[PDB]
């Protein structure tokens, strides 16, 4: 009702951003590093974020904004109940730099710290994923539904190794994969983008996604797409989902989400709001 | 060009197989296990192989045939100089059972024990990959070229955890991923199919692919696609590529392939010809 016009505008912006990404893919890139040698950024990430943030500020000046590259530039995240846009200009910068065909624009929109709508545009494959509270989840006009698989022994999981090259984090990430593989499970997949990995849970192609070390902007868009497809969001502890906690289990069911949580050793991480 | 009419027929068959797969995806499946609880097979794998084997035998009765499900039924692999069709009716059965959108039909054609042509049809995304000796590599008519990245530190790799749930094998698989991640590299991806992972190297989306435990039918199709895109095939030791060895490094260059090989601890495996 008051937010549908925001969602309609956000889809138009996601498409403009996808055109910018696809155009930069045709050209040579200057690749910069951020927190680690595997944490990449390009001028495209910065240019896309500047376009999105300027476009939303002009149309909705009283709204709040949280963006991956704005935080990298020094802007401090202060999460409120306020209408908030949580942007990831290029989710999958490593994929983008390499031309690995899964690169997304993620636009999340929160009211009362709860997800209202989310847009995840997988721009190379031209797949527009959308979710809106009580309105359903879609991919290019196709309504989405999570899988029915509650048995972990017959489960297919999506995850990422992460950008961290810190020895102890890498050890915990790999040990958690080993614990899950040993249950046993049917397998683990990685397309290289948190948002697209979560959208694969929403379509029912994967049963669950889990990750530690991601940020609010990686999951704000896809989070509502999973829940509107019939899925659940949970903290890796089994506790209620926390957007600023850097941790998530996005699953088809509570049963599977709780089962995954029992296998995960937590990585110590600085919160997005600390 | 006698091998061109075979290649034209192989494309038509791969499309027919793709249709049988996409149709089976709409229905409920009875899932069976083979070597481990994560080594899956369905009636579709068997029905697709029967259609492929029958269709080639009718058109090319003098030709030899090796197929995944035929070997599982007890047919012994005797690799000769004869024109041989090497079939993987559904490459990515775990993906197929789960509706994870990367499921391929792989058809490899060899003459004088050398890859002539290869077809890899990623049927859910409708991506037809082809390669033919001295004729180039294509995806839906678009000519393919491997990446220029020889520096491992700026490399994006593709691999799979494998179907084995044996603790020691899983430990070696994960220990190799840890060694590679620690170099450091840009990252690791897993779409859940050897043939599609190999095709991502051919497009230049990934810089290299490595795996142990796969079979001749997993790589006969995609092998010639990688080399026709300008890439290299090598053993996981650095040694010459051997189709029956159950091991591969499919890379953009010898430099990168040799570098990955230095990091890999071998898993003991029974050859496809033993
Ligand atoms: Mg980003
Ligand atoms: Mg991201
Ligand atoms: Mg980033
Ligand atoms: Mg199989
Ligand atoms: Mg197969
Ligand atoms: Mg296979």
Swiss-Prot record, chains A, B:
Enzyme class per UniProt: hydrolase
Reaction catalysed by this enzyme: a myo-inositol phosphate + H2O = myo-inositol + phosphate; 1D-myo-inositol 1-phosphate + H2O = myo-inositol + phosphate; 1D-myo-inositol 2-phosphate + H2O = myo-inositol + phosphate; 1D-myo-inositol 3-phosphate + H2O = myo-inositol + phosphate
Cofactor(s), by name: Mg(2+)
Inhibition and activation profile: Inhibited by Li(+), Ca(2+) and Mn(2+), but also by Mg(2+) at concentrations above 3 mM.
Gene3D superfamilies: 3.40.190.80, Fructose-1,6-Bisphosphatase, subunit A, domain 1 (3.30.540.10)
Binding, Mg(2+) 1: 68, 88, 90
UniProt GO cellular component terms: cytoplasm
Primary localization: cytoplasm
UniProt cross-references to Pfam families, sorted A to Z: Inositol_P
UniProt keyword terms in alphabetical order: Cytoplasm, Hydrolase, Lithium, Magnesium, Metal-binding
Ligand binding (Mg(2+) 2): 88, 91, 218
Chain positions recorded as substrate binding sites: 68, 88-93, 192-194, 211, 218
Location of this chain's protein in the cell: Cytoplasm
Pathway: Polyol metabolism; myo-inositol biosynthesis; myo-inositol from D-glucose 6-phosphate: step 2/2
EC number: 3.1.3.25, 3.1.3.94
PROSITE patterns associated with the record: IMP_1, IMP_2
Induction remark: By lithium Li(+) in hippocamp.
Subunit structure, interactors included: Homodimer.
PANTHER family: INOSITOL MONOPHOSPHATASE, INOSITOL MONOPHOSPHATASE 1
Family of this protein: Belongs to the inositol monophosphatase superfamily.
Name recorded for this polypeptide: Inositol monophosphatase 1
High-level lineage: Eukaryota, Metazoa, Chordata, Craniata, Vertebrata
